[PDB]
Structure formats: C-alpha cells, structure tokens
Amino acid sequence: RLFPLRCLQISSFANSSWTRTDGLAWLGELQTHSWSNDSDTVRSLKPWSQGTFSDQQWETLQHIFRVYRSSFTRDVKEFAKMLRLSYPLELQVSAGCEVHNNFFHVAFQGKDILSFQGTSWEPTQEAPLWVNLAIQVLNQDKWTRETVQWLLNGTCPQFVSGLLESGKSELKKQEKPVAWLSSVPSSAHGHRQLVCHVSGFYPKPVWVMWMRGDQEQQGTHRGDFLPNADETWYLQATLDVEAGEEAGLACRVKHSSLGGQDIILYWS
C-alpha cells in the first residue's frame, strides 16, 4: 500500500496581461491541499493536512510558496521574451516524494521539457533545442537549486511521514459499494447491453463480473474508475446479450469492505 505525495501546479498564460496559477496536493487518492490563485494561503482540506509539522514549520513553507508563485510567473514571462516563445503558454508542475525517492517534473504545452535531477535542472530525453538555453539560466540560480534540493530531500520526506501517521485512520478507511442494474439498447438488432453499476466503494481495488451459474462471462467489459464527490469510486461493467438469453444472468461484486460477502444481482 503506497501513498505518494503529488504536488500539482497548473500555470496558464493567455497573454502578457492574463495569468493564473492553481495548485493542489494528493496523498494516494485523497486530495490533501488546495491552492487557489485568488488566495494568498494554501488551504488545508483535512484535519491532518499539516501532519507532524507545527504551525510555525507550516508558515515557513507557506511564505516560500507565496514567493515562488510570484517569482514563477515573472520568470516565465521573462523566458517568453528571451526564448522568443509565443503566447499562449501552458505550464504544469509535478513534484513531491514517497516515504518507504523524490521528483520534480515540469511540462510545456502538455509535453515534458525538463526535470530536477540531483542538484540541477536537466532537459528531458525528448526536448526542443531552446530548452537547453533555459536550463543554462536556471542552473545559474544557485539559491533556487539549493531550496528545491532542500524541499525535496529535507522538507518533503519528513512531511509525508507526518501525513501518513496523522491520517492513517482515513487513508486506510473502507467504504462499502452499492450496486444496481440497467439496460440500454445495443447497436446491433436483437441485442441488449446490460449494465452493472458499482458505486461508493473504497479503496480503489474492486471485482465486478457478469455470471451465468459459476461461469464467468468473458464478454464483460470493465469501465474506468470514476470518482464521486464524497471521495468514493464509481464503476460499471457492461455485457451485450441477445434478446431471450437474458435469463440466468447475474452481476457479482467483490470488495474488501464486504468481508468475504459477495453482492449478487440477478437480471430481471
């Protein structure tokens, strides 16, 4: 059970006059922090979002991020005029660590351009030529390279360790799924698509399969894990069936929260 900390940044630049920066933090699958552009403060979403960190340790990081946001915006506009890059600009930052390695990845226009490796910035394997010129400028900033190295290797590992302990009760929580059936018409004539919805389960792993007797139907199509507003998951498994061959069909659901008790839903 791994719970990596993902610090996400979304910075957009429409013109030389308009710019937004919004951020957030993920511990596993739970969002722990919200950093709105309109706020001078990184908002905590949970009672244990600070972890072991005292309020004084937390305000230190608070001011650092506040300076970073204003400085990041300035540098990008400077890099735009310098490297002769046209607006609009889209930048995304993915940073954080997992306690048992750390990472810093930035992306330009949805594509990787550079990352922070060791003690300096390095361009990605697939990266345009102008990136190397930006790296040369970034690497001259000795204070930033020391601060990032101090945050990723010093501040982050102690912070995640503080989060996992202070919020072990919510991270290891178990929510029971609820299932129901429906049927939309199929693309082919004489066929029907049965849908088995599964919602409200946590954690993510779950097992859904359409059944006849003890025989698993390989025609079952598992969907994607869709999120709910209450930090639970939604999932549906479909099955195309002929008209008249719908009898005997059942949807079986297995989840860790049920304690070895299957959820069975026979059709009609």
């Binding site: 996400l8 979304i10 957009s12 919004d22 957030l24 993920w26 969002q31 919200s34 709105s36 609009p88 889209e90 995304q92 993915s94 992306a107 226009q109 949805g110 594509k111 990787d112 609820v178 129901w180 429906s182 049927s183 939309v184 919805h197 919602s199 409200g200 994607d224 869709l226 999120p227 709910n228 507003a229 209450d230 939604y234 549906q236």
Partner: protein, 98 residues
C-alpha cells in the same frame, strides 16, 4: 496540441424517481485546461453546481469532476454540456437511465 474532452455522466446512488440523488459529470483528456462545464435539467442550466479543483493525470492531460443534487423523475432529463477550444461546437452528453 489540443486534446478533445471526454465526458461521462453518472449518478452517485441507485436512481429512483422522487428520491434525491447526486449527478456527476466527469470530464477528462482535455488540453488546454481552460474549459466551460454546465449541467442541465430539461435544457436549463442548473445553478447549484460545485466543481472539484482541476487536476491532471500521469500523462499531462487534465480532468475535473462536476456534481449537483438532483431528483430524477419520469419526464425530467439531465445532461452535461462542455465548451472547449478543441471543438467548434459545444458537446452535450445526456444522463442515461432506465
């Protein structure tokens, strides 16, 4: 480059007429992150809509969850409409129930 938003509409609880429920609209795989999302009841924009903070997957594409309280009936229809730069016309996906 630009990426077309994928839209998925689903309810939180088993849909039952006359019973209050939650409607979800999950938009994924879009870029740039600038996007407009509306949830519709009978064609009209639902005012009480909350949206989670926009985030992005491992591949740099964005995703965002929209949800609202709704009480499904026989005659009422519900849909999620999305306006993005990757498309010339707004994309509308209806809530499929039976």
């Amino acid at each position: 480059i630009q990426k077309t938003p994928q839209i998925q509409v689903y309810s939180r609880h088993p849909p039952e007429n006359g019973k209050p429920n939650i409607l979800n609209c999950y938009v994924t795989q879009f870029h740039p992150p600038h996007i407009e999302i509306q949830m519709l009841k009978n064609g009209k924009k639902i005012p009480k809509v909350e949206m989670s903070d926009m985030s992005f997957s491992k591949d740099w594409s964005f995703y965002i969850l929209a949800h609202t309280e709704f009480t499904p009936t026989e005659t009422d229809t519900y849909a999620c409409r999305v306006k993005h730069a990757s498309m010339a016309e707004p994309k509308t996906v209806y809530w499929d129930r039976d």
